[PDB]
């Protein structure tokens, strides 16, 4: 009867099927405290802040993964070709449950770091930003991935969009706390509250890089927060139509992408109906309705290099999936990179 | 007069010279093994627990015989009462109020039965060394949160385990989805593990056969759970 309980019941039925013997280890992690990473603010004194985080015994898992890029014995390209650059995110060792202190403003008056599910950084990394990129964050609020996109220093322009005016107010608070009034109040960033599904009509063929981090059953949060829970009886229609909405959003993101450009779709759900199925649905929609060819890009090497930090469900048809584990209680985080070919 | 002793001692059970030479090694050295004789059983265990905490020799027979009539009234007679004196020798030397308070807590706070209480006392001597109320909360955890009714709480020697061991293993199973609280009339959709396979077995066996996870995952969980507890309490 609590929505939190209907969520667990729903997950038990679906994810014991998806994951089998693996489900319990994921389940216990979903029901225990999430592990966080500290994304260093590159607009603050990043070197100093990095040193303070290191002194806590935390380590930059991005640098650690990247330093092993050409190990694994091969990589499709150098790390700098494949991953968005300049992102420093510190996490404690596997099995270490320490919390970071809350961030405070430093000398430049901006917050020193941003605490987040470390897994959330992966779709941003996998998107492969490069200098001069025109970038769209289609479902941006409250702005964790938006902030990371900006931190790369690769966004010549960043469109940050979110249908909800109130959640956009949270994103604006974050930009004001983290980003100097120079980048955020310039020509660089445009913040809107428009329906992301309309993007193909608004700015077709415009963006080099698009992130589509969709509304979803938000599995972990749905097990912990009773208020405005997607599993409430009052939202059942809404809940069940989610994959339709998710396909429409990814399709729009693709329509907004230049031919040759790249898109990362992500969710924080374990459900294949919201993950692989949506990727496949959008690609089919684009082929059939627009005669546009979309190619899923292989993130295998990317996954392998980050396996020192995250547990992954390796049998994903397309895309990759970080699964919660007690040794590394990150995610759920599904992500799939693709390129618009035509 | 080693005749006035070894007559009664060798007619009763003294296997070899053995523990009698150990008794010499360690009038009160005879009036006590009689109280133990009446307690009963323990022909070789009497030597075993004479070696373990020889203090029984120092114990005054007026006090000891009072303690023996006391335990017999609790149902520890017929004796054995075997594992009790083995792992809890303190029972014959501790404050009587301790024992009576435990009885008065089991009975009528937690209910059970004179037979159930005698059973617990015999099987879970730990309960005498454990904080009262902590004991009550532990019963409550068994009954209200685990959904174990009285007969299984005694049958499985549940009350013997630390509340930390109980919470760690039970909550782990619950979050793994491998333990379900009985609904009403005590039905679960999936049977639950035997209480012994949860609490009695070693940690390695529990994790191998019941929780079915790695040991490192459980160690992390214990740390997570301890912080949860500290932070609500
Ligand atoms: C999982 S959240 C985004 C999290 C965000 N990218 C971050 O990293 O902080 C999905 C967002 O989609 C927004 N949303 C729902 N429907 C939308 C639509 N049709 N167009 C654009 N945004 C939408 C919700 O307001 C919600 O903030």
Radius of gyration of chain B (CA): 22
Q: For this experimental structure, what is the resolution in angstroms?
A: 2.0
User: What region, left, alpha or beta, does residue A110 occupy, with left being phi > 0 and alpha being psi -120 to 50 degrees?
Assistant: beta
Q: HSE on the CB side for A335, CA within 13 Å?
A: 27
- Parallel/antiparallel/unpaired status of strands A320-323 and A333-340: antiparallel
DSSP helix/strand/coil, B154: helix
Q: HSE on the CB side for A310, CA within 13 Å?
A: 30
The closest alpha carbon to A333, from A214, A174, A159, A208, belongs to A214
**Dist. CA A159–CA A178, nearest whole Å:** 17
Number of Cβ within 10 Å of residue B66's Cβ equals 12
**Dist. CA A145–CA B122, nearest whole Å:** 62
**Dist. CA B208–CA B193, nearest whole Å:** 13
Ligand 1 centroid distance, CA of A331 (Å)? 17
CATH of the domain at A339: 3.40.50.150
Are A298 and A331 within one domain?
A: yes
The set of protein residues with a Cβ atom below 6 angstroms from ligand 1 is A 120, 139-145, 161-164, 167, 195-197, 213-215
Please, what's the b/e burial string for B32-64 (b: 16 or more CB within 10 A of its CB; e: otherwise)? bbebbbebeebeebbbebbeebeebeebeeeeb
CA angle at A5 for the pair B198 and A20, rounded to the nearest 5°:
55
Are A85 and A138 within one domain?
A: no
Angle between helices A23-30 and B215-232 (to 10 degrees): 20
Ligand 1 atom closest to residue A268's alpha carbon, by position in its atom list: 1
* CB atoms A327 and B223 under 8 Å: no
Number of Cβ within 10 Å of residue B207's Cβ equals 20
DSSP helix/strand/coil, B208: helix
Q: By the 8 A CB rule, do A338 and A295 touch? A: yes
Domain that residue A39 falls in: 1-115
Ligand 1 atom closest to residue A211's alpha carbon, by position in its atom list: 6
Which residues lie below 8 Å from residue A162, measured CB to CB, with a gap of 6+? Answer: A139, A140, A141, A168, A171, A192, A193
Ligand 1 centroid distance, CA of A162 (Å)? 5
Q: HSE on the CB side for B92, CA within 13 Å?
A: 30
- Parallel/antiparallel/unpaired status of strands A155-161 and A257-267: unpaired
Last-in-domain residue among A58, A88, A115? A115
What are A264's two structure tokens?
A: 């990362």
**Dist. CA A66–CA A320, nearest whole Å:** 18
* CB atoms B217 and A27 under 8 Å: no
Is residue A143 marked as binding? yes
Strand partners, A159: A136, A190
Is residue A12 marked as binding? no
The closest alpha carbon to A197, from A240, A260, A138, belongs to A138
Which residues lie below 8 Å from residue B221, measured CB to CB, with a gap of 6+? Answer: A28, A32, A326, B168, B172
Q: How many residues does chain B have?
A: 233
Total of domains in chain B: 1
Domain that residue B40 falls in: 1-233
* Number of continuous H segments (helices) and E segments (strands) in chain A: 14, 13
Is residue A21 marked as binding? no
Determine whether A154 is an active site residue: no
Are A96 and A40 within one domain?
A: yes
Q: By the 8 A CB rule, do A252 and A223 touch? A: no
Is residue A303 marked as binding? no
What are A105's two structure tokens?
A: 């403003």
Tell whether A17 is within 8 A of chain B (Cβ).
Answer: no
Q: HSE on the CB side for B87, CA within 13 Å?
A: 13
Are A199 and A315 within one domain?
A: yes
Q: Tell me the shortest Cα–Cα distance from A74 to chain B, in angstroms.
A: 31
Angle between helices B61-71 and B31-39 (to 10 degrees): 0
Query: Which of B212, B219, B220 faces A24 most closely, judged by CB atoms?
Result: B212
Radius of gyration of chain A (CA): 19
Q: Tell me the shortest Cα–Cα distance from A203 to chain B, in angstroms.
A: 47
Tell whether A90 is within 8 A of chain B (Cβ).
Answer: no
Place of tokens 């109320």: B133
Residues of chain B contacting A28 with CB distance shorter than 8 Å: 172, 175-176, 213, 217, 221
CATH of the domain at A17: 6.20.240.40
Tell me B2's DSSP state. Answer: H
Tell whether B188 is within 8 A of chain A (Cβ).
Answer: no
Please, what's the b/e burial string for A296-335 (b: 16 or more CB within 10 A of its CB; e: otherwise)? bbebebbbbbbeebbbbbeebebbbbbbbbbbbbbbbbbb
Query: Which of A24, A33, A326 faces B178 most closely, judged by CB atoms?
Result: A24
Strand partners, A115: A38
The closest alpha carbon to A319, from A281, A264, A259, A269, belongs to A264
Tell whether B228 is within 8 A of chain A (Cβ).
Answer: yes
Cα A55 to the chain's mean position, in Å?
Answer: 27
Tell whether A16 is within 8 A of chain B (Cβ).
Answer: yes
Are A289 and A187 within one domain?
A: yes
Is residue A258 marked as binding? no
What are A161's two structure tokens?
A: 């969009």
DSSP helix/strand/coil, A189: strand
Could you give phi then psi for residue A323, rounded to 5 degrees? -110, 140
For CA atoms A126, A132, A137, A141, give the dihedral sign. Answer: positive
Ligand 1 atom closest to residue A218's alpha carbon, by position in its atom list: 1
Ligand 1 centroid distance, CA of A139 (Å)? 4
Name residues 21-50 of chain A within 8 A of B (Cβ).
21, 23-25, 27-28, 31-33
Are A108 and A131 within one domain?
A: no
Q: HSE on the CB side for B65, CA within 13 Å?
A: 8
Which of A154, A216, A268, A336 is flagged as catalytic? A268
Ligand 1 centroid distance, CA of A285 (Å)? 21
Q: Tell me which residue has its CA closest to atom 1 in ligand 1.
A: A215
Ligand 1 centroid distance, CA of A81 (Å)? 28
DSSP helix/strand/coil, A187: coil
Could you give phi then psi for residue A261, rounded to 5 degrees? -80, 180
Total of domains in chain A: 2
Are A187 and A321 within one domain?
A: yes
């Amino acid at each position: 009867f609590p929505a939190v309980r209907l969520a667990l019941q729903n997950f038990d039925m679906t994810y014991s099927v998806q994951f089998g013997d693996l489900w319990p280890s994921i389940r216990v992690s979903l029901l225990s405290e999430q592990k966080y990473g500290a994304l260093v603010n590159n607009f603050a004194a990043w070197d100093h802040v990095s040193a303070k985080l290191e002194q806590l015994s935390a380590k930059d898992f991005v640098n650690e993964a990247i330093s092993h890029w050409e190990l694994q014995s091969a990589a499709p390209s150098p790390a700098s070709w494949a991953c968005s650059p300049n992102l420093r995110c510190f996490t404690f060792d596997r099995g270490d449950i320490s919390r970071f202190p809350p961030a405070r403003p430093g000398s430049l008056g901006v917050m020193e770091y941003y605490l987040m599910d470390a897994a959330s950084l992966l779709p941003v990394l996998a998107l492969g930003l490069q200098p001069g990129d025109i970038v769209l964050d289609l479902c941006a609020a409250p702005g964790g991935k938006t902030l990371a996109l900006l931190q790369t220093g690769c966004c010549r322009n960043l469109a940050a969009n979110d249908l909800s005016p109130s959640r956009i107010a949270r994103l604006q608070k974050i930009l004001h706390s983290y980003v100097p009034e120079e980048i955020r109040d310039g020509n660089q960033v445009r913040v809107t509250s428009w329906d992301g599904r309309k993007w193909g009509e608004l700015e077709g063929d415009t963006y080099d890089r698009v992130l589509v981090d969709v509304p979803c059953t938000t599995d972990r949060h749905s097990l912990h927060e009773e208020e405005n829970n997607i599993f409430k009886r009052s939202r059942k229609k809404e809940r069940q139509i989610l994959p339709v909405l998710q396909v429409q959003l990814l399709a729009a993101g693709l329509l907004a992408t230049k031919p040759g450009g790249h898109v990362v779709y992500s969710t924080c759900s374990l459900s294949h109906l919201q993950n692989e199925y949506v990727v496949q649905g959008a690609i089919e929609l684009l082929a059939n309705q627009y005669s546009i060819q979309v190619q899923v890009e292989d993130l295998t090497h990317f996954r392998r290099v980050f396996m020192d930090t995250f547990c992954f469900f390796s049998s994903c048809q397309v895309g990759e999936l970080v699964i919660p584990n007690l040794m590394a209680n990150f995610g759920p985080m599904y992500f799939c990179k693709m390129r618009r070919l035509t | 007069x080693x005749x006035x002793x070894x007559x009664x001692x060798x007619x009763x059970x003294x296997x070899x010279x053995x523990x009698x030479x150990x008794x010499x090694x360690x009038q009160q050295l005879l009036d006590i093994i009689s109280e133990f004789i009446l307690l009963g059983l323990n022909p070789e265990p009497v030597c075993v627990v004479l070696k373990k905490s020889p203090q029984l020799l120092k114990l005054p027979i007026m006090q000891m015989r009072k303690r023996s009539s006391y335990l017999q009234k609790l149902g520890l007679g017929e004796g054995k009462l075997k594992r009790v004196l083995y792992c809890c020798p303190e029972i014959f030397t501790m404050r009587q109020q301790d024992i009576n308070d435990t009885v008065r807590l089991l009975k009528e706070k937690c209910l059970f039965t004179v037979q159930q209480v005698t059973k617990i006392l015999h099987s879970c001597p730990s309960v005498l060394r454990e904080d009262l109320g902590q004991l009550e909360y532990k019963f409550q955890y068994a009954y209200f949160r685990m959904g174990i009714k009285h007969p299984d709480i005694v049958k499985s020697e549940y009350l013997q385990y630390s509340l930390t061991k109980i919470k760690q293993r039970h909550i782990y199973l619950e979050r793994l989805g491998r333990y379900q609280t009985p609904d009403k009339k005590g039905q679960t959709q999936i049977p639950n593990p035997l209480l012994k396979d949860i609490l009695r077995v070693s940690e390695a066996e529990f994790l191998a056969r019941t929780a079915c996870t790695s040991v490192e995952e459980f160690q992390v969980f214990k740390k997570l759970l301890a912080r949860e507890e500290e932070e609500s309490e």
